[model samples]
Each structure stands twice: as structure tokens, then as C-alpha cells.
Target chain A: GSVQIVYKPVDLSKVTSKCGSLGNIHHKPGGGQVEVKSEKLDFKDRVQSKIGSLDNITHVPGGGNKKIETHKLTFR
Target chain B: GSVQIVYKPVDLSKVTSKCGSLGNIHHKPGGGQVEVKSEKLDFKDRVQSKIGSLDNITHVPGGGNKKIETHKLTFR
Candidate 1:
């Protein structure tokens, strides 16, 4: 019973019509923050695809067997 | 480059002459606590060998790519 939770900010500008399967992402109008919570390993894959990098990703303790939380992203 | 760190308490009583490769563990004389820091996945394998179960294992963000920390153990 481990769950991984990731929270981050996505840039709306980088998102394009070609962006595939981001799946109901919620952020501010001008691009704000979002979070992803899951128990499966696929979370990493999805996040990596959208952000194009995992270097700054970090995880913290949560209410589950396993949990991961990503800090807000920096997009310029 | 990511590193994983694990911290936990080990019971001296459970340790046997036959106990293999725990590798330089440092705990208080009467079993206080210990910490393990490593960048390799082998840490999980080594820990699992020493402890019977991994149900209580959890991780948090650390100063590396990946980090894992285990809370103090309960041995009776």
C-alpha cells in the first residue's frame, strides 16, 4: 500500500495541441501549479514526459506506503 | 545523479553469527538508531536481506536524485 504524490507547476505556453494524454490537468489561466497523486510507477513516466526533466524532482513523506511530491517548476 | 538514504534501528538480538554482509552498521550499544546513505539500488536489496519485511519502509526528499529513509524499527 504505497502511494506516490507529485506536485508541480506547468507552463501553459509550452503545452500545445499536439501534447498527448496530459489528462485533465488543472492550473491557473496564465500557468500556475498542479499536483499528481498515484500508487503506480507510471507517474514518473508521465511527469517526465511533460516536464522533459526529472533533475529537480523530489519527494517527501505522505499518508501512504510510498509518496512522492515534486516542487513547483521553473519555466521561462 | 540521485542518491538514496535510509535510516533505521536494528535489533542486536536478531543479528546472528550467520548474519551476512550488513556492512559496517553503526548503532547505539543497546540499539538506538542507524542511518544508511547510498546512491545505488543495492541498498534496498541489502536492507531486505537483513530485515524480514519492507512494509514499514518509507522515503523522503533528500539532497540527491533519489532518497529513501526508514523509520526506527520495532523489535520484540
Candidate 2:
């Protein structure tokens, strides 16, 4: 139960217009699930992006638990 | 004489068939020459894709009209 990640990709319309202000996105425990940490962006010769760990955006239908994974943030 | 630039590289195969498709690259008379437009794709801790531009196909002793130029239409 710990989260604080950012590499790029968090414009869900700015969390639908400033919901959390945009910051903090991290989560560990990778094997059964819960691995949120991203930062893959390197297109040199053609393609090469790394920096893994993602999965924690499960169940969010007219709800509010804030679970929608895919990190690596920038380009505000 | 200006051309509308896209955010991603045009598939050279797709433009060249997914030849190189990054995302909304731009050129704004940065150093020399003129300027163009495009978006920015930022990656962190690793990835940091910025929309830029490229070269144009010159000396087409085998072709014509297709003055190929690259404004970050994705680079491979």
C-alpha cells in the first residue's frame, strides 16, 4: 500500500480537471499484481522504451477508489 | 509555402508502413532555416519524446515530385 510514480502519461483530462492535482503514482508488489511504475520513451534507431511496472486501475465504474494504472508522466 | 505537420511520424511503410510514428513533432525556426509545428510527447526517468523534424529526400534520380521531407513524422 504505497504509491509515488511518474514518468509520463497522466492527462486523463488532468484527472478530469484537477482531482488530485497530478502527482504521486506509485505501487509495488509485483507477482500477484499491483506494479505501477513507468517511464519508457526512447525512439532512436526506431523503438526502445523501458521502465516497467503497471497494473492497478481495476474497477472504476461510477466509483471512486482511484485505480487506473499506466504511469510515466510529463508534458503537462 | 507551408505544410501542416502531424503530431506523429507518418507511416513511411504506413508512411513506409509504420516507418516511424512518434507523435506530433514541431519545428519553430529554432536555429537556422524556418519553423514548423507539432506537439510534444514527454517521457520521464527515461523516455522524453519531443516533437521535432527531419530531412527531405533529395536527388531522386529515380523519381520526382515526391520531395520527401521529415518534420518529426516519426523517425525510425
Candidate 3:
């Protein structure tokens, strides 16, 4: 599918207030995204700050990976 | 934030059933995606089937443009 990267502000208040995950987000990379999904909350926390930034991102020699999750329940 | 491209099937039934779009999709290009937004439904129609495929994507001489939209309504 034809997808484009639109630069926009990410609202944190929604993510902070919501119990689930700010109602939704679906991102897929076409040779241009890194994946660091950790099942553990604590570890994810340690990496959260890192994941939150891109100045000191770790680059794989191969390329950035891709990912997309199907919303089974409510997208909201 | 770290994102990845996980290739998978897209559920069209859901997109077709709803009056609005299938409620949720957010994608950002880290130098790896194409962007094409047509506010016009008519032009978008001529392009819908094309947008539905990836084999013949247009290549901008500069680079892939980026895009992202903050959901105003329900992520649904």
C-alpha cells in the first residue's frame, strides 16, 4: 500500500491519561523503521527514554526493521 | 520512538463496513516511505486501486516525503 510519513506532533497527554495506549497507533516501515518491542514493562521503561529519542539511535548494519499490529479489539 | 515494519495481511472487510475509515492507522517514514494525500474523494478514487498496491510506487527525486496525522476523532 502507498503510505507516507507525515510530520506531526505526538500528543503525550493522551498516552499518559489512557489505560490502554492512547486509543491507537499503527506504523509500518518500508526499509525505514527500527523495532524494539519488549514485553517487560520495567525493561521497556529503561529503554523508553532511549526509544523516545533519535539523536543517539542504534543503527543496524543491515537496515531498519518493520512492524505493524492488527487491531483486534477497539481501535479506540 | 522505535518503529518497525512487520509485513502482514490488511483486513479490507473492516475498512469497507465502516462509514468512516477503519478507525486507525498512523505511519511515519524515517526516510523509507512514500506519501500521497488527496483531499478530493474523486481523485482519490482514481488512485485508490493504485494506492492499494506497492509494486509501482512513484519515486521522488529528492526522497520519500514523510507524514503523520494526530487523530482528532475516535481512533475507532
Candidate 4:
């Protein structure tokens, strides 16, 4: 009944080896972690750079106005 | 990089007729809207109740500690 945002690190090798796209980084709110192998030491940074370019804008129905919001993810 | 939360109304008939479960209610932050048909007037309320029962808890790696966050959604 509810939607949620879950934050997690992108798989290292997948992002660095070009085996995964941004779609691979998504996770459901309560769905536990899904881990994949990676060989790059900077895999997390690569994911950050890739996701940083996304635009978070939505057009709501009231006159089809637009709402923009910023999202930040920190991987530890 | 970032993950975001998007808010919108749940489809009416899907929720009421039991055609959709909580999974059908999820949306990615920038993935626009996915429209589905529903027939119940209380669909929104039903979704709210279902989501409310979820526990937003995650275990972080440092000492395997747990962190809990609350989320809210408003639909118009």
C-alpha cells in the first residue's frame, strides 16, 4: 500500500565493467540487499557519477505543473 | 548518486478488487507515473493502512547496527 525509497551501494564490477546500467541499482523499500561481484575499487564512485546526472522532476496534474526535488545517496 | 521517494494515489479498483498487492503501489522517483485501473473509493485508505504496517528498518554494516526511518506520503 505504500511506496518507499531504499538506499544501497551499486555493485562494483557491474558498474565498472559496464555490465550493469542504472536500472541495476534500484531496490524496493523493504526488499533486502542484492549483492553482485565487482572488481573495481572505485565502483561506488562510478555509480555516484552515473546516478548524479539524473533529473528528478515530475509533472503533477494541477495545471500540469512541475515539481522538482533533489535526492542524495550515501554508501557506507 | 541518489534514490528518491515519489508520492501518488494508489489505483482504486486494483486495491479494492485484490488485483494489486503492495508491490503494485511502488514507483521509482523519476520514473513518471504508471496508471492502473481500480474500482474502490477507499483504495487510497486501504493502501495507507497496508503501508503503515511496514517496518522501515535497515541494518548498517558498522557493528551491524540497525537504523529506522519514518516516511510519509500525501496524495491529491
Candidate 5:
């Protein structure tokens, strides 16, 4: 459960093309060599970015109004 | 994700058959009229149980290794 924030009212076509071509760029450690390959976009990154837009993010406060301890728990 | 601990060396067939039939049991809040229905197995429970077996867990120590903390991070 992570979130991504992308601004709207932007150029979807240009953004789609630009962001679409961000394939895997493989770089060896310690500046050995670099290889840029144009392969299928990673499914995980594709799904993550596709749904990554900021919207109504509701933060439900816990009962009794104590300090927030955990970010993931939803106590009603 | 939370984990469920089912003791090993137990009867697999019995557990599977028993657990397979368990479904949503609707208990009305505030003591209202309700009924219990057994349908498909809960997908959440099934998936959670399938990947939570205690065989392939790996624990890596953090750098400098001051004190154990922050359960989910892999600090190298």
C-alpha cells in the first residue's frame, strides 16, 4: 500500500509518450559499464504509475484522539 | 501483512477440509437480526495463508547494527 502523486491538467499525450519510454536502464556498479535496453515496461512500475494520481486521501483519525502511532492501522 | 500461525505436523486434510468451507459469517452490529451464510472461501485468508509459511524467511542485519528496529527494512 504505497501512493504516488501526479499532477493533472498536464499534457497527457506528451506525458504518456515520455513516461512510456522509460524502459529499464541497466548500469553496472562502480561505473563499469552502462546498457540501455528498450524492453517491455515493467509490469509493477506500469501499474504503479498508471494509477498514481493524487486525489482524496482520507486519513481517518483514531478514537480517543491520541498521538498517531502507526501509519497503516485504521482504528475506528 | 498479518500472519496466521497454524501448528505444523497437524492433520492437513482435516484442516483443509474444515477451512475450505469456512465463509462469511455475518453478525449484525448492535445485536440486530442477521444470518450466517457459507459461500466461497475468503480470498484474503486463502492468499495470506498460502504465502505465510515459515520456511523461506531471511533476516539480514543492518549496517553498523546499533539496535534492532523497523521490522520491514532491508538495510545493507
Candidate 6:
């Protein structure tokens, strides 16, 4: 199993929606875990964002309203 | 307005739910866009993943089963 740890806390509502901007997120696997840090986003945002195998990253708030078709699809 | 762009293409299915692991993603907003490039996940994954105001980041496939409560709340 693998683990991604953050140095702070975060709110999903704010990260994906309320956030002003997301800057650089740097993740390096070390100390038996993926150590993640961000400059623009806080450590909490980094923690919520699993850096490696992101099984936990399942949904974003109010995603039902967004259309999946507008996004370019690259099925090949 | 700002933009985050990748040098390749990606599948939403593989990035958040599939792929082996996500490596270092270096994004520097330059030349009128956030020049995003990833060595481990591929340029496609980087491209699929917008690095800035991620309003596009609304949903993850199969996200309905995952419990939102397990996610620690840091509203303080």
C-alpha cells in the first residue's frame, strides 16, 4: 500500500470551488510516504489531494451541473 | 483569464482512477498559459489536469460510492 501525506488541512469546497488560484504542487515520495507541498494552494489542499494512486479522489462538489461533453475527449 | 495546458493528452478514466502513479507535475504559467508537463503521468495526463482555477475539476468517475465523511473536515 502507498500513502500521500499533507503538512496541513483543507476544505474541499474551497479547494475546487472557492480557491482563488492553485499554484505549483510538488510531491516527492520519501520517508515511506509521498510528501506533498504547494506554494499557491495550502498544505491542506495538498493533503486533500492525494499525490500518487488517488483512489480517494472521486468527486468534486456540484459536478452534476457541469457537462462532460464540453471537455475534449481523446478516445483512441 | 488564466489557463493551464498540458503538452499531451489524457483520459479522465485513467488519471484519477487508473494510472499506476502520478509523478512530479511541473506547471509554470508562461507564454499566456500555464505550461504544464509531467514526466511520470505523461503530457496527456498533465493536459487533462488543469493546474489553476480548477472549476473544470467537478467530478471523478465512480465517485458516488466513496464516503465524503471519511475525509477529515478542517473547518476551524
lDDT of 3 by residue, B14-45 (tens): 10111111224344434533344333322212
lDDT of 2 by residue, B23-65 (tens): 2222222222223232433433534442222322112111111
Write one digit per residue (lDDT tens) for candidate 6, span B13-52. 2112222222234332212222232334323222333342
> Which stretches in model 1 have alpha-carbon errors above 4 Å?
A1-54, A66-76, B1-76
lDDT of 1 by residue, B1-76 (tens): 4433233233222111121122222211221222333232222121322211111111231111222332332222
Query: Candidates' DockQ values?
Result: 0.02, 0.02, 0.05, 0.02, 0.01, 0.04
Q: Against the correct fold, how does model 5 do in TM-score?
A: 0.15
What RMSD value applies to candidate 1? 29.0
**Where does model 4 exceed 4 Å of error?**
A1-30, A42-47, A50-64, A67-76, B1-76
Q: Give the winner by DockQ.
A: 3
Report the C-alpha displacement of residue A23, candidate 6, in angstroms. 1.8
Per-residue lDDT, model 6, residue A62, is: 22
lDDT of 6 by residue, A1-76 (tens): 4333233332232212222323234323222222233434223222333332311122322222221212232211
The native-contact fractions of the candidates, in order shown, are: 0.03, 0.01, 0.09, 0.02, 0.00, 0.04
Native A-B contacts reproduced, model 4: 0.02
User: Best to worst by lDDT, what's the order?
Assistant: 6, 3, 2, 4, 1, 5
TM-score for candidate 6, residues paired by index: 0.14
True contacts kept of 5: 0.00
Query: Which lDDT tens digits does candidate 1 get at residues A1-76?
Result: 3322233233222111111112222211222222333232222121312211111212332211322332332222
Q: Between the candidate structures 1 and 2, which one is better when assessed by DockQ?
A: 1
How many clashes show up per model? Answer: 4, 34, 11, 6, 0, 2
Across residues B1-76, which tens digit of lDDT does each residue of candidate 5 receive? 3332222121111101111121222212221122222233323221321211112122211111121112121212
- The local distance difference test score of each candidate is 0.24, 0.26, 0.27, 0.25, 0.20, 0.27
Lowest-lDDT window of 10 residues in candidate 1 chain B?
B13-22
Worst 10 residues of 4 chain A by lDDT: A12-21
